[PDB]
Amino acid sequence: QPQQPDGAPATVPLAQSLGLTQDEVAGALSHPMVHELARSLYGKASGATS
Amino acid sequence: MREIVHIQGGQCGNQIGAKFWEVVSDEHGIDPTGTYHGDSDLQLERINVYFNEATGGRYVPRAILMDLEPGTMDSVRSGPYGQIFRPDNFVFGQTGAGNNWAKGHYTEGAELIDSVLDVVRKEAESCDCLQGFQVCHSLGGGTGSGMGTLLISKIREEYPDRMMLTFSVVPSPKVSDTVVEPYNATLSVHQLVENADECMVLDNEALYDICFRTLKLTTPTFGDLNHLISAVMSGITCCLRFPGQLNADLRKLAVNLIPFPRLHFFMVGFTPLTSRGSQQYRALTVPELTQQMWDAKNMMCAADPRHGRYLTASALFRGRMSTKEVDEQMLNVQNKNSSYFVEWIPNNVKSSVCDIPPKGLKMSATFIGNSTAIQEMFKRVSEQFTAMFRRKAFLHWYTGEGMDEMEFTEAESNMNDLVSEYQQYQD
Amino acid sequence: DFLTYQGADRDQRARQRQAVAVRTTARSEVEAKLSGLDDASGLDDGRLQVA
Amino acid sequence: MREVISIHIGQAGIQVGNACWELYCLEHGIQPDGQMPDAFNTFFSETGAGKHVPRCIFLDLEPTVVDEVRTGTYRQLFHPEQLISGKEDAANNFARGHYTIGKEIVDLALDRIRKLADNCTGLQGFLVFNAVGGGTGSGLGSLLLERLSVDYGKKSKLGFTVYPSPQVSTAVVEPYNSVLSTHSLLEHTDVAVMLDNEAIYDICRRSLDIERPTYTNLNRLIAQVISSLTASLRFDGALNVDITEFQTNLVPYPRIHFMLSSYAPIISAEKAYHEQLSVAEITNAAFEPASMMVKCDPRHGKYMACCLMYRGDVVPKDVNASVATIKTKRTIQFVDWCPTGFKCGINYQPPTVVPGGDLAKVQRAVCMISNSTAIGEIFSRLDHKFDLMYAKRAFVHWYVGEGMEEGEFSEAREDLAALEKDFEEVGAES
Ligand SMILES: Nc1nc2c(ncn2[C@@H]2O[C@H](COP(=O)(O)OP(=O)(O)OP(=O)(O)O)[C@@H](O)[C@H]2O)c(=O)[nH]1
Ligand SMILES: Nc1nc2c(ncn2[C@@H]2O[C@H](COP(=O)(O)OP(=O)(O)O)[C@@H](O)[C@H]2O)c(=O)[nH]1
Ligand SMILES: [Mg+2]
Ligand SMILES: [Mg+2]
């Protein structure tokens, strides 16, 4: 990981940096589309990361 | 004051004639609403040849639209120029032939025939002088073949002295939409020789070739192919609809092009076909229309006229032109190559001039050709049929609908007799 | 009002015909744009210019 | 109106029909609760105001899959009384599904067919779904097709039957059920489209690049095949192919009604961008022997009749240019007495893509359902396995006790062997 430039803004974390709601961050894995994504990622054994 | 009764059958008939009535109504100036907007008085002079007078100034075409599936009728009604037809002339079934000539001719076509003769007879006695019946259908299918050729047979015994122009597309070797197309075509031609007065032989393999190499069209659709036939169907009866220096009715063409009663199949070509890129290079003169007229590439049939001699030819010229060099050009090609013409008919080519050109063109012409080369497209369907019939393939979809194998044998009996007569005059 | 079912089926037929008309006009526009393509329509002009 | 009824029998029937009606509601924009936010009349019956019901029956002897639809994401879609359940399953017993526990559930099944027949104005066929490897799919599939022929005469039946694979199969007594059910579907199904799970396993592995496919992945591309088969009725196209047009252009003889199936573009989105999917490119992919959905080698036999269902932006010219190059190819063989063996079907609507499926958004697709003589190898391999089964008479007491007679295996033996004789002599030249 490259070292940050001097006088860095100390950037805020990603979730409420881009504006995720509490319902979305609680049920990220409960959504049907995320479930289908996880199913296809399971199906692609080693080619998931390809 | 003569009238042409128009009948379209099947998907091909309802789609060709959609472009046909688009061309003709635009040529006479009828709007898609149904009123008159013609610039010249000659357009309104002959409305009766294709259109019926209606109350309130409406002009309704003399078209009887039929098929066995209502899906195609929704396309022709809802398209442009689609509301001019009578709704009651939209006679249709609901079962569908399903590419079966046995179904279209015997089982479920027959109930719909009683509906269409009510429409035709009401329309026939509506007009005062029947010039003839014009029909457009397909031979490869089953909706326009079985139902179409029973309609031709039934209106023959009701009106025997009237003409019968049949625009029929035929199955092709290179392009094949239907598996059972040799069964439907051969059984339709056998029912066409003794009934049809004269046949306009068309095909899809020639229109695709014309649209590709002549019009330079990268993506030709059926509507592009329908425009080529629609220009022809207006060009055959062009002298009926307008005055001219030398006029030609349907029976003018029938008496000239039919030497013997069974030789009533003709090949057709349309002359002023040029791509928009090549339009500026062409100089529109009669020798340039004639040189495209007699070229085998511009013909709209699979038959190559270089293989067989021309039994009799025709010429349907439209536009202002000179009757010397029109007549000189027809006899100049008869002497440039007399091997391609039959010897015992001096002056094979018949000519006729109409002074009203179509929309967007200043000069145009239409070619009708009676050649013995059209035996090539009859042998080609028959050789496909006799390959299937020996193994009796796909037969239970025909013999299960009430016909024997004897009708197939007599279908090839007339088919082999038709090529026998055409081969004899080639020698 | 007493014969609302006749009006209902008449309106159903009218809506069916209108929907088929809209679909066929859209398809007609698409096939007209497809049929407009030819040699006069600009193709390979970039090839001629680069040559 | 072009209106058809789909019948799903057995565990494979309910799971395939879940994937088919997911595609069917998405094609017409039907939300899962049944609300539209008239091309839907082929499958969806408009009830009253703003509500659409499937024209399907889900009958199965085990209840555990029928209540899964009742509690899944499509509870509000299906009419609850069309979904037929039973107390217990047949459990790979053709005797049970046809004789013992098939009696009390086929009377409720025919009553739903009777109510659906009067609701539809013009019926065009029955799309029957079953698996011949299972007891309910065979036994109740056999018994329902017996009753359909007597009650409903001359109406077409589209049979998409899942057939056992030579190598990979999930049960031991599949050669008993597949052979016995062959007698029923030979005389009664007008069109029998074979399906093989191992070929669809191989289709998924090499094309979709999905190396652990599950039953959801197989049924999703089965759903595309059934949808593209019937896509001509629902949406207007250049060359419409009715249901009745398939029988008149695929089967030349009554006893020969088995056809293969193949879907040409099975392409993931990471493969879709780099690949130019043209009509000539996908027509070659349709006739690929390894792209067939049934594990057989079409090079071994001779093609008898072929049907091509094109979808999307397919001009009617380049399909003919693709067909002409197919005919000139010497690897594909045609029988001599069928010189024109192609049926072409062009529909203007591109196939929809399910959110969550592995398939990508492709403009054009081809569904190829063709008849060949290479499908005699399909019944011959199961004829060898059933020969070993009946020789020492294993697992017969599970069949003899539950109604069946001993000679019922024998009568199903030469009947499938006469199918071998019929397919051998028809493709032979003369
Ligand atoms: N492709 C595919 N095949 C399936 C699916 N579900 C079941 N099968 C097939 O069904 C076979 C097992 O027999 P089944 O049809 O499930 O038997 P059943 O329907 O449960 O009937 P009984 O066993 O008597 O209760 C397996 O070999 C599978 O090939 C599915 O979802 N997709
Ligand atoms: N030129 C032309 N040919 C068509 C058209 N529609 C269909 N065909 C041809 O008709 C053949 C099939 O005919 P079919 O539609 O089954 O006729 P039907 O059974 O009477 O409806 C195909 O080989 C097509 O080439 C059209 O609009 N124009
Ligand atoms: Mg005169
Ligand atoms: Mg079960």
Coordinates of C-alpha atoms and ligand atoms in Angstrom, one line a residue, chain D residues 9-16 60-62 65 88-94 96-97 101 130-139 162-165 168-171 174 177 195-198 200-201 214-216 218-219 222, ligand 1:
Chain D
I9 CA -45.1 -33.4 -13.4
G10 CA -42.6 -34.5 -10.8
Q11 CA -39.7 -32.8 -8.9
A12 CA -38.1 -31.8 -12.2
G13 CA -41.4 -30.4 -13.4
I14 CA -41.9 -28.1 -10.5
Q15 CA -38.3 -26.8 -10.5
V16 CA -38.2 -26.3 -14.3
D60 CA -46.5 -33.7 -7.6
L61 CA -46.9 -36.6 -5.2
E62 CA -44.5 -35.3 -2.7
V65 CA -41.7 -29.0 -3.5
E88 CA -46.5 -39.1 -0.1
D89 CA -44.2 -39.5 -3.1
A90 CA -43.9 -42.3 -5.5
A91 CA -40.2 -42.4 -4.8
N92 CA -38.7 -43.8 -8.0
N93 CA -41.5 -46.4 -8.3
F94 CA -43.2 -46.5 -11.7
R96 CA -46.6 -46.4 -7.5
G97 CA -47.0 -43.4 -9.8
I101 CA -51.2 -43.7 -5.7
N130 CA -41.7 -34.5 -16.6
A131 CA -38.5 -36.5 -15.8
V132 CA -38.6 -40.2 -16.9
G133 CA -36.0 -41.1 -14.3
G134 CA -38.4 -40.5 -11.3
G135 CA -41.4 -42.4 -10.1
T136 CA -43.8 -39.5 -10.3
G137 CA -42.4 -38.1 -13.5
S138 CA -42.8 -41.5 -15.2
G139 CA -45.8 -43.1 -13.5
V162 CA -35.6 -35.2 -18.8
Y163 CA -33.9 -38.4 -19.8
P164 CA -31.2 -40.3 -17.8
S165 CA -27.6 -39.8 -18.8
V168 CA -24.0 -39.3 -14.3
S169 CA -27.4 -40.1 -12.8
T170 CA -28.9 -39.6 -9.4
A171 CA -30.7 -42.9 -8.8
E174 CA -33.8 -45.1 -13.5
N177 CA -38.5 -46.1 -15.0
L195 CA -33.3 -33.5 -22.3
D196 CA -30.0 -34.8 -20.7
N197 CA -28.6 -33.4 -17.6
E198 CA -25.0 -34.4 -18.3
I200 CA -26.4 -29.5 -19.9
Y201 CA -23.7 -29.9 -17.3
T214 CA -26.6 -26.5 -9.7
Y215 CA -30.2 -27.4 -10.7
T216 CA -31.2 -23.7 -10.8
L218 CA -29.8 -25.9 -15.6
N219 CA -33.5 -25.0 -15.4
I222 CA -34.1 -24.9 -20.2
Ligands
LIG1 N1 -32.3 -30.6 -15.1 C1 -33.0 -30.9 -14.0 N2 -33.3 -32.2 -13.7 C2 -33.9 -32.4 -12.5 C3 -34.4 -31.4 -11.7 N3 -35.0 -32.0 -10.7 C4 -35.0 -33.3 -10.8 N4 -34.4 -33.6 -12.0 C5 -34.2 -35.0 -12.5 O1 -35.0 -35.9 -11.8 C6 -34.3 -37.1 -11.6 C7 -34.8 -37.7 -10.3 O2 -36.2 -38.1 -10.4 P1 -37.4 -37.1 -10.1 O3 -38.0 -36.6 -11.4 O4 -36.9 -36.0 -9.3 O5 -38.4 -38.0 -9.2 P2 -39.6 -37.3 -8.5 O6 -40.2 -36.2 -9.4 O7 -39.2 -36.7 -7.2 O8 -40.7 -38.4 -8.3 P3 -40.5 -39.5 -7.1 O9 -39.0 -39.8 -7.0 O10 -41.3 -40.7 -7.3 O11 -41.0 -38.8 -5.9 C8 -32.9 -36.7 -11.5 O12 -32.1 -37.7 -12.2 C9 -32.7 -35.4 -12.3 O13 -32.1 -35.6 -13.5 C10 -34.1 -30.1 -12.0 O14 -34.4 -29.2 -11.3 N5 -33.4 -29.8 -13.2

